Amino acid sequence: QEFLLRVEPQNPVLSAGGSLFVNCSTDCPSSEKIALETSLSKELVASGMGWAAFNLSNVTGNSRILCSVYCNGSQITGSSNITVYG
Amino acid sequence: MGNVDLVFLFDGSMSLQPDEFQKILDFMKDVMKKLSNTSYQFAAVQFSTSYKTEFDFSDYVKWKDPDALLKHVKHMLLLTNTFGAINYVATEVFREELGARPDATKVLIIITDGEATDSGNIDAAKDIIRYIIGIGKHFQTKESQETLHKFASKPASEFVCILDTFECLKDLFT
Numbered sequence: 001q002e003f004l005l006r007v008e009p010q011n012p013v014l015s016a017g018g019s020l021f022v023n024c025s026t027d028c029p030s031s032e033k034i035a036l037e038t039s040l041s042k043e044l045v046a047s048g049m050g051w052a053a054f055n056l057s058n059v060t061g062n063s064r065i066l067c068s069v070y071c072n073g074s075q076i077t078g079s080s081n082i083t084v085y086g
Numbered sequence: 087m088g089n090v091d092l093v094f095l096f097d098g099s100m101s102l103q104p105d106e107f108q109k110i111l112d113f114m115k116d117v118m119k120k121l122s123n124t125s126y127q128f129a130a131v132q133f134s135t136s137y138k139t140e141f142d143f144s145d146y147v148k149w150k151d152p153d154a155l156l157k158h159v160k161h162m163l164l165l166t167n168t169f170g171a172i173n174y175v176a177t178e179v180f181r182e183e184l185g186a187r188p189d190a191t192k193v194l195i196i197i198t199d200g201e202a203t204d205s206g207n208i209d210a211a212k213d214i215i216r217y218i219i220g221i222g223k224h225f226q227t228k229e230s231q232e233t234l235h236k237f238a239s240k241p242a243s244e245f246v247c248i249l250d251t252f253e254c255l256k257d258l259f260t
């Protein structure tokens with residue numbers, strides 16, 4: 001019925017500007033269509049039951065990401081604010 | 087040329103950078119300025135997780151000023167529920183109560199990077215001519231191209247193009 005969509009890592013603070021592995025997962029039974037909303041270059045690198053992992057490249061600045069998935073026909077979302085320092 | 091009721095359905099999702107969103111706003115204003123004093127009347131809807139009619143056909147007839155009509159727009163910065171967005175336009179925007187003309191040809195200009203966080207179908211908009219105007223780094227991805235083909239009218243060569251040159255829209259003037 002009501003489940004949460006976890007975004008790992010949560011509110012990460014990194015430097016430079018290389019890549020980051022983000023995993024969006026949920027324990028919702030028979031979840032449907034996990035998607036990552038971001039302005040950063042992304043590539044789906046792995047997936048399983050209830051989760052999808054993406055590799056975000058060219059992270060030169062702070063950027064907020066959102067993940068979504070349908071749980072019991074309803075859309076739920078998770079967020080993560082990426083902070084970059086120089 | 088008969089009457090044309092055209093709706094700009096523009097992407098306000100987080101996947102488009104602030105500068106890209108501003109380019110979308112400027113693009114809609116420019117296209118409307120070139121179509122002023124014609125058989126065209128407009129409405130604009132911003133879509134992300136939810137949908138917002140920024141101005142309707144009656145607003146256009148009263149103001150006839152694209153800059154004024156879109157000045158208030160605030161970037162939603164959420165998801166990209168395009169399927170629901172197209173359905174919202176089909177049933178909630180193309181309405182006589184909002185200034186739509188029953189006799190007019192219905193046109194939809196969808197400005198987006200082509201990604202979609204939702205699903206379903208757009209059978210409700212089967213009688214609406216749909217153009218896709220691409221912008222954003224995600225537009226040229228395999229995922230986006232496969233997704234946008236489900237929204238654009240056919241053939242894709244005639245209805246899909248990029249925001250910078252908008253070549254596919256020049257037929258709207260002939």
Ligand SMILES: *[C@@H]1O[C@H](CO)[C@@H](O)[C@H](O)[C@H]1NC(C)=O
Pocket residue numbers: 023024025026046048051052053
């Ligand atoms: C992603 O997270 C889920 C849930 O914790 C886990 O089962 C899965 O192994 C993770 N996948 C990756 C690539 O880390």
Ligand SMILES: *[C@@H]1O[C@H](CO)[C@@H](O)[C@H](O)[C@H]1NC(C)=O
Pocket residue numbers: 010011064079080081
């Ligand atoms: C920062 O990220 C968290 C997710 O953990 C989100 O709830 C919060 O709204 C974000 N802060 C901002 C930018 O409003």
Ligand SMILES: [Mg+2]
Pocket residue numbers: 037099100101102165166199201
């Ligand atoms: Mg998006």
